[PDB]
Amino acid sequence: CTFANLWRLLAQNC
Amino acid sequence: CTFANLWRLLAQNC
Amino acid sequence: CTFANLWRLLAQNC
Amino acid sequence: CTFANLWRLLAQNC
């Protein structure tokens, strides 16, 4: 549950 | 690319 | 400023 | 449950 994982998902989906 | 989707994908770990 | 905190704050809506 | 609210909370907390 990290900012890193948020950025990863934003990069993958947006 | 919706926040609801990302929030749900992050739910397991958060 | 932690993603865990933001995810929890957004649980109210998501 | 929106990107807009995520950004608001990021601005407030980070």
Numbering used by the authors:
A (entry chain A), B (entry chain B), C (entry chain C), D (entry chain D): 1 to 14
Show sentences the authors wrote.
In initial studies, dimers of the CV1 peptide were determined to be exclusively antiparallel with no detectable formation of competing parallel dimers or intramolecular disulfide species. Dimerization was dependent on α-helical folding of CV1, yielding highly α-helical dimers.
In contrast to the previously proposed dimer interface involving tryptophan residues, the structure of each dimer in the crystal structure reveals a canonical knobs-into-holes packing between Leu6, Leu9, and Leu10 as expected for a dimer of α-helices. Cysteine residues extend beyond the helical segment of each peptide to form bridging disulfide bonds. Asn5 and Asn13 form long-range hydrogen bonding interactions within each dimer, which is consistent with the slightly decreased stability of the N5A and N13A dimers relative to CV1 in CD experiments. For each dimer, one of the Phe3 residues and both Trp7 residues are oriented away from the dimer interface, suggesting a limited role for these residues in dimerization/disulfide bond formation. While not contributing to individual dimers, the Phe3 and Trp7 residues appear to stabilize a dimer of dimers in the asymmetric unit and help to rationalize several observations from previous and current CD data. The interface between dimers resembles a hydrophobic protein core and is composed of four copies each of Phe3, Leu6, Trp7, and Leu10.
